[PDB]
Amino acid sequence: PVKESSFVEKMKKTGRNIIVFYGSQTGTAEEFANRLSKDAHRYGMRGMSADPEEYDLADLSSLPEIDKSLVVFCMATYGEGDPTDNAQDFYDWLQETDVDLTGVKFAVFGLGNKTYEHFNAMGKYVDQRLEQLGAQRIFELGLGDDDGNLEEDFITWREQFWPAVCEFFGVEATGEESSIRQYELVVHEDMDVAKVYTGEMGRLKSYENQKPPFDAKNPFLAAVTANRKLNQGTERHLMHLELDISDSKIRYESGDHVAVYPANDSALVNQIGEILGADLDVIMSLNNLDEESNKKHPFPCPTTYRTALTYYLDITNPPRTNVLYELAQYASEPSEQEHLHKMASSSGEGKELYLSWVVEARRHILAILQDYPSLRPPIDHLCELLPRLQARYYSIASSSKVHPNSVHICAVAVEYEAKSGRVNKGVATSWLRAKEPALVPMFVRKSQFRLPFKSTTPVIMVGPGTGIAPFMGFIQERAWLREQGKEVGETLLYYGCRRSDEDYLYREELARFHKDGALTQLNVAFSREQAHKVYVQHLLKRDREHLWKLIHEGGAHIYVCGDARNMAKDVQNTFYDIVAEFGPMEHTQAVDYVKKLMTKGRYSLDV
């Protein structure tokens, strides 16, 4: 592991009074942290972002040694209300700890989604725990909602945050504005092709000469063994991929996740270089104008613009308000420069404009640059404002017991008409779809979704659509525990699709698993073969009687995977309704009964 030296001392030697910590998994908490950090400057202060995993939060008790010190926590909730992987140490510390944080000023902005069981469990916990330890709070806990518009929640929070900080402290709004760069463009008018980054994530040339172990910092270029179309119809594109993980010493069980690092669309990369009048084949690097940080570049350098745009940056998701504000200065046409600046707006017509014209219309960077022709920003700066391309996760669709050498992926390619007028393409899926048996930089993330330990326990699997991914592994494995002489309890699947002749995923394989008894019951819900919708819940409601026999008397485990928005919630109320009917109890006590099955490892979600 190896922690970094005391962050308070580091702040002392750099004149920083505020540190902002990020509990990120996909770069959102990290992004917010960075914005708040650089914000401090225009308020008579100097901030600093930081990954908790790299430090000993115990040093928190030292922040008081710095004048007008402040710690902010931008945390995201994940798993069953669990903290993000980098926040684990911290979360764990917060508990065992006895430390006295007297004199510590803090504030917490949490990132969650009401769509889940444990809304901002992590954020709410950090804010609550630090106060117990003795630290004082200088601002109300923030509850951003990804389900609605997380970006806006953060803005209204940030808008109220700083003034309170300013008030509590002597500081105040200093000067007009800023427009300060984090990096310096050092053009390498000529450099050694062997010292140039071509798209690897960690060590230089790590993609070329592979060498275990492999992880998020060191992905394993797995070869694409197969890429099969699963959908019968033409409405959408659902595909099956098999990645060759031989000689990678990678370990995985059914239920785990596989992460992939994709490549943006080149037409979209080139057009950005083209409208910007820039040459993407310029070799360069952007070194931190702060020679005191670890983050020397905002991505592997030296590299070419083309490379950063292709493998290191996000050019398809809607630009955040701060990025747009920073760009406004490049709009020659004043009316256009207005719209841009006014989208960072505190609220009002501007907050209406950004939400509909950019987010709803789902305008990526290039689209903006096209609708505001007077906006031509220098390319080296745009690269500094663009967020990093994140790896995409997929629920490994195979069993290690059976395919220890391969990691399968069941996915639906994203492609749609945006409202922006253009057709959007899903980064990872469009990329995977183009792979023809072909390497995919990947890596596995251990999950909590797991078959039960004793092969005899009954399992109920509810996975509509692609939510069947992990279950293909589960079944593959149980089919194994039977072919292997072991005794297996009932294995039930509640799958759903549109029509059996359109997107019945794994129709054939699933039939074999039924004609062999690996699948006790194969209960499929064809949502569009009749005027009314027939969903999994309905099948569940139908078998209410038997399901209570496996749940209440059989000690069966419940697994739900798929859509979190509705399916998960719907499928849940049904289980409440079931329990509330059999071995009768009030509603309220049926929900507590159910919520108590998820606690005891018998009701697992993965949405």
Ligand X SMILES: NC(=O)c1ccc[n+]([C@@H]2O[C@H](COP(=O)([O-])OP(=O)(O)OC[C@H]3O[C@@H](n4cnc5c(N)ncnc54)[C@H](OP(=O)(O)O)[C@@H]3O)[C@@H](O)[C@H]2O)c1
Q: Residues marked as binding for FAD?
A: 362, 392-395, 410-412, 416, 426-429
Q: From CA 182, how far away is CA 38, in angstroms rounded? A: 9
Q: Which is nearer to ligand FAD, 427 or 547 (CB)?
A: 427
Q: Which of 113, 182, 293, 345 binds ligand FMN (CB under 6 A)?
A: 113
DSSP class per residue in 232-301 = SSSSS-EEEEEEE-TTTT----TT-EEEE-----HHHHHHHHHHTT--TT-EE-EEES-TTSS--SSSSS
Our finding on whether 412 is near ligand FAD (CB under 6 A) is yes
Stretches 23-31, 453-461, 526-534, 550-558: which one binds ligand FMN (CB under 6 A)? 23-31
CB of 447 to ligand FMN, least distance (A): 9
What's the rounded Cα separation, in Å, for the pair 312 and 208? 17
Binding residues for ligand FMN, how many (CB under 6 A)?
A: 20
Nearer to ligand X, 382 or 468 (CB): 468
Contacts (CB under 6 A) with ligand X, residues 504-563: 527-528, 533, 535-537, 561-563
**Backbone breaks in the chain after residues (C–N over 2.5 Å):** 437
DSSP annotation of 537 reads H
Can residue 76 be called a binding residue for ligand FMN (CB under 6 A)?
yes
On whether the CB atoms of residues 544 and 460 are closer than 8 A, the answer is no
- 272's tokens: 């950005």
CB of 171 to ligand FMN, least distance (A): 28
Structure-token match 């030292």, residue found: 62
Output the CA–CA distances (angstroms, integers) from residue 117 to 113, 210, 465, 567, in the order listed. Answer: 9, 40, 22, 14
Stretch that binds ligand FAD, among 224-232, 327-335, 375-383, 388-396 (CB under 6 A): 388-396
The contacts of residue 165 (CB under 8 Å, 6+ apart) are 43, 70, 107, 138, 139, 171
**Sites for ligand FMN among residues 214-233 (CB under 6 A):** none
Q: Which residues share a beta bridge with 22?
A: 74
Give residue number: closest CB to ligand FMN: 112
255: left (phi over 0), alpha (psi -120 to 50) or beta: left
If we measure between CA atoms, which residue out of 406, 409, 428, 426 comes closest to residue 418? 426
Count the residues of the shown chain that bind ligand X, applying the rule CB under 6 A.
24
Rule CB under 6 A: which of 337-366 touch ligand FAD? 362
CA nearest neighbour of 332 among 358, 305, 359, 369: 369
Beta strands in 60-135 (DSSP E): 70-78, 82-83, 105-112
* Contact call for residue 466 and ligand FAD (CB under 6 A): yes
Q: What does the alpha-carbon distance between residue 607 and residue 592 come to, in Å, rounded to a whole number? A: 21
In the list ligand FMN, ligand FAD, ligand X, none, the entry touching 408 (Cβ below 5 to 8 angstroms by class) is none
Residue 360 contact, options ligand X, ligand FMN, ligand FAD, none, Cβ 5-8 Å cut-off depending on partner type: none
**Minimum CB–partner distance for residue 467 and ligand FAD (Å):** 7
Count of chain residues binding ligand FAD (CB under 6 A)? 19
Q: How far is the CB of 583 from ligand X (least distance, A)?
A: 26
Contact 78, 25 (CB under 8 A): yes
Q: Binding residue for ligand FAD (CB under 6 A) from 69, 227, 316, 321?
A: 316
Residue with smallest beta-carbon separation from ligand X: 465
Binding partner selected for residue 562 from ligand FMN, ligand FAD, ligand X, none, CB under the kind-specific 5 to 8 Å limit? ligand X
Helices (H), ranges, 495-551: 507-512, 536-542, 544-548
Decide whether 34 or 466 has the Cβ nearer to ligand FAD: 466
Residues at the binding site for NADP(+) are 236, 466, 527-528, 533-537, 570
Q: Rounded to the nearest 10 degrees, what angle do helices 150-168 and 28-39 cross at? A: 30
Touching ligand FMN, residues 139-198 (CB under 6 A): 146, 150
Cβ proximity to ligand FAD: between 52 and 467 the closer is 467
Q: Cis peptide leading into 302, omega within 30 of 0?
A: yes
Contact indicator for 561, 463 with CB cutoff of 8 Å? yes
Q: Which does 93 bind (CB under 5 to 8 A by kind): ligand X, ligand FMN, ligand FAD, none?
A: none
Options 124, 392, 557, 602; binder of ligand FAD; rule CB under 6 A: 392
Q: Which two tokens stand for residue 279?
A: 């040459």
Task: CB nearer to ligand X: give 137 or 544.
Answer: 544
Report if residue 78 touches ligand FMN, rule: CB under 6 A: yes
Candidates 83, 123, 219, 465: give the one binding ligand X (CB under 6 A).
465
By CB under 6 A, is residue 81 in contact with ligand FMN?
A: yes
Q: Choose the stretch contacting ligand FAD; rule: CB under 6 A; options: 11-19, 75-83, 157-165, 423-431.
A: 423-431
Residue 498 interacting with ligand X (CB under 6 A): yes
Tell the smallest beta-carbon distance from residue 22 to ligand FMN (Å): 7
Among 63, 268, 469, 578, binds ligand FAD (CB under 6 A): 469
Beta-carbon contacts of residue 213 (< 8 Å; ≥ 6 apart): 249
Are 217 and 201 spatial neighbours (Cβ–Cβ below 8 Å)? yes
Q: Does 395 bind ligand FAD (CB under 6 A)?
A: yes
Which partner in ligand FAD, ligand X, ligand FMN, none is near 411 (CB below 5 to 8 A by kind)? ligand FAD
> Do residues 462 and 540 make contact, with C-beta atoms less than 8 angstroms apart?
yes
Q: Binding ligand FAD by CB under 6 A: which of 230, 375, 428, 578?
A: 428
User: Min. distance of Cβ 415 from ligand X in angstroms?
Assistant: 12
> Can you tell me which residue has the tokens 């079931």?
578
User: Which of 522, 521, 529 is closest to 502 using CA atoms?
Assistant: 529
Residue type, 457: T
> Residue 557: which of 598, 510, 502 has the closest Cα?
598
Applying CB under 6 A, does 412 fall inside the site for ligand X? yes
For binding to ligand FMN (CB under 6 A), which residues are involved?
24-29, 76-78, 81, 84, 111-113, 116, 118-120, 146, 150
For binding to ligand FAD (CB under 6 A), which residues are involved?
257, 316, 362, 392-395, 410-412, 414, 416, 426-430, 466, 469
For binding to ligand X (CB under 6 A), which residues are involved?
395, 412, 464-467, 469, 496-498, 527-528, 533, 535-537, 561-563, 566-567, 570, 606-607
